[PDB]
Amino acid sequence: TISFITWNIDGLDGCNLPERARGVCSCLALYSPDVVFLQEVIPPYCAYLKKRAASYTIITGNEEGYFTAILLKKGRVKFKSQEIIPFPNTKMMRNLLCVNVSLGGNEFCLMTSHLESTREHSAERIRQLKTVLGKMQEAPDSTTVIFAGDTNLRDQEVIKCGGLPDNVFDAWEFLGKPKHCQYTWDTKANNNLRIPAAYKHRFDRIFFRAGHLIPQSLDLVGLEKLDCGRFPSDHWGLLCTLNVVL
Numbered sequence: 001t002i003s004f005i006t007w008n009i010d011g012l013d014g015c016n017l018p019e020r021a022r023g024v025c026s027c028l029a030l031y032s033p034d035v036v037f038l039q040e041v042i043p044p045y046c047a048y049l050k051k052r053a054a055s056y057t058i059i060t061g062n063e064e065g066y067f068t069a070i071l072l073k074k075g076r077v078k079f080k081s082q083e084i085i086p087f088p089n090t091k092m093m094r095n096l097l098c099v100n101v102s103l104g105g106n107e108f109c110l111m112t113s114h115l116e117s118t119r120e121h122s123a124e125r126i127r128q129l130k131t132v133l134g135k136m137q138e139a140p141d142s143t144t145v146i147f148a149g150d151t152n153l154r155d156q157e158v159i160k161c162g163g164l165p166d167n168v169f170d171a172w173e174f175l176g177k178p179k180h181c182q183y184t185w186d187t188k189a190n191n192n193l194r195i196p197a198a199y200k201h202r203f204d205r206i207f208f209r210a211g212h213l214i215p216q217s218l219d220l221v222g223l224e225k226l227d228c229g230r231f232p233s234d235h236w237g238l239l240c241t242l243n244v245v246l
């Protein structure tokens with residue numbers, strides 16, 4: 001059983017950022033995942049993870065502005081190589097971060113990305129998804145491909161893209177679409193962005209390809225308000241546990 005968390009930690013919001021970074025690390029410590037996929041990370045935040053979550057090796061998708069990051073549990077996940085695929089037409093520094101690792105006796109290709117945000121950038125977001133899905137298919141058959149990140153997908157844009165390739169599955173859909181963790185971005189239960197209206201979306205998703213391995217559980221994390229009266233982020237974390245068939 002391997003476990004991981006994907007989480008957009010809202011590094012772009014400056015308010016209570018130090019205290020919220022404490023909240024994220026507190027959360028990570030409780031679940032102690034093998035891998036962590038992060039989005040909207042910024043340099044000072046990165047420096048903080050380096051000394052507060054020192055049990056993880058940190059691979060960042062950039063070193064300026066904001067970027068993604070993949071954290072690997074020292075002693076359980078071994079780093080092999082990394083690759084950063086650019087999005088030529090991104091206007092928000094977005095890209096595809098790939099890290100090859102060994103976890104147990106199995107080879108994995110770990111992928112994360114923060115696809116273009118907002119509704120008006122649907123077109124570019126779809127082109128970026130095609131790139132990602134395409135990259136998942138190129139990996140050798142020997143390795144297991146796991147993608148987890150902030151996709152910003154909505155209004156069923158997955159169809160325009162052409163649908164998932166026949167060998168790739170959405171973890172949430174695979175488990176039968178559990179309602180308790182359907183929405184990872186909810187302004188009705190989350191007040192960080194100060195929004196009077198109620199919006200619920202499944203922006204954060206997990207794609208994988210095999211029936212070598214299958215998902216076992218999916219849960220939301222970071223549900224506890226902090227002292228400052230705000231959540232660690234406007235996004236909920238997403239904790240997934242995949243099992244391996246032997």
Ligand SMILES: Nc1ncnc2c1ncn2[C@H]1C[C@H](O)[C@@H](COP(=O)(O)O)O1
Nearest residue numbers: 008116117118119150152185201203235
């Ligand atoms: N600049 C701006 N104006 C309009 N609405 C915005 C803006 N930035 C983010 N958002 C909204 C749109 C997304 O659905 C949500 C999460 O973005 P995410 O990138 O997934 O954190 O936040």
Ligand SMILES: [Mg+2]
Nearest residue numbers: 008010012040
């Ligand atoms: Mg954001």
